[PDB]
Amino acid sequence: EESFLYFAYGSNLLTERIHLRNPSAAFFCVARLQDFKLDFGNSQGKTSQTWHGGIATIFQSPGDEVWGVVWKMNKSNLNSLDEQEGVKSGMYVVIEVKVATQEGKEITCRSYLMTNYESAPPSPQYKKIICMGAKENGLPLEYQEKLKAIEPNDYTGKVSEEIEDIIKK
Template sequence: METIQSCTHTRLDGNLDVENGQNDSFLYFAYGSNLLRERIMLRNPSVVFLTLAHVLDYKLAFGSFQGKPSSTWHGSTATIVQAPGDEVWGVVWKMNTTDLCSLDSQEGVEAGIYVPIEVGAHTQEGKVLTCRSYQMNNYVYGFPSPQYKKVQHKKVICMGAEQNGLPADYQKKLDSIETNNYEGPVPVFEEIEAALRVSKTVQ
C-alpha cells in the first residue's frame, strides 16, 4: 500500500496517470457506497464505469474514525484493511481530475478521516490496474446504519454490487453485514433515493 497525494496538490501521483501519460483522468477503485452508480454520480458527474476488479490481501471492514460514527451516515462506514490471503471486490471508475477534490471531500480526506491510497486492482481478464482508493485513519470497528446499507429494501452497497455484477458469493457476504438499527433521517440517503427514481424514469 502506498499513500498518495490529495487534491490539495496540483496533480495526482504519476503512477495514476491514465492513457499515454496524460493527467486529465484517473482510476478509482470503489468498494463501499460508491459501488452504486447513483451514489457516486451525486457529486462526481464525470464518472464512467470501466470494469469489475478485486484487490488482493485486503478485507472489507466497517468502522468509525477515532470511534466517532459518521455524521453523514449515522454509523460506521466501509474501509479496507490489510489481510493476507483475503480479497475485496469492487468497481473501477474512470474519472476526470476535475472531480478529484469532490471525491476527496466525500471521503473526508481534509478532515483526516480517510487517506487516499494506491492499490493494484485485478480485473477478470487478468490485468492489474493502478487505482486510487481510500482507507480509514484511526479505525475503530463498528456497525453501519441501515441507511448506509439499504435503499428501497436493498442495501446501498449490495445494490451497487448487484447493479455491477460482482460475484454472487461476495454479494452474499455483503448481505450478511449487521447494522446499528439507526432509524433517524439521513439526507444523503434521500438524495440517492431521488436519483434512483430518476434513473428508473430514464430507463
C-alpha cells in the same frame, strides 16, 4: 492520461450514488483487491451523521479479498474526490491500489482507507446502498453474499432525502 482511475468498494459502488457529486464518473470495470479485508467503523471515534453507522474501510489481511468497481474520472476531479472522501480532516487517507478484473488484468487505482478508527456496524441504509451497487455493477455473486450477510446497526430514523428515494425504488 488526462483522466484518473478510482477504485471504490463502498457507497460509490452504486452508480446513482457516486453520480450525486461525481455525475461525470464513467464505469470502467469490476476488479478484485487481494490481501485486503473489508470492515466498517467510526473515524477517530466519530459517528457519521450522514449514514448513522460505521463507514467502509479496508486493511491488509492475507487470504481476504475486496471486490469493487474502477471508475474513470477526469483528473480535474482529483481534489474534489479527496475533499469528498474527507482527506483533509483525517477521515480517509489517499492510497494507490493494484487490482485486477476477473480476466486477470491488473490495474492501478486511487482509493481510500482510514488509518485511525474503531470497528462499528453500518446502518441498514448504508448497507442497502452498497448492496444495490454490488448487484448493479455485477460484482461476483459470491462476494455479494458476503455483503448481504453484513449485520447492520439498529437505525431506522430519518436519513438523507436524496438517498431515501434511491433506496425506495
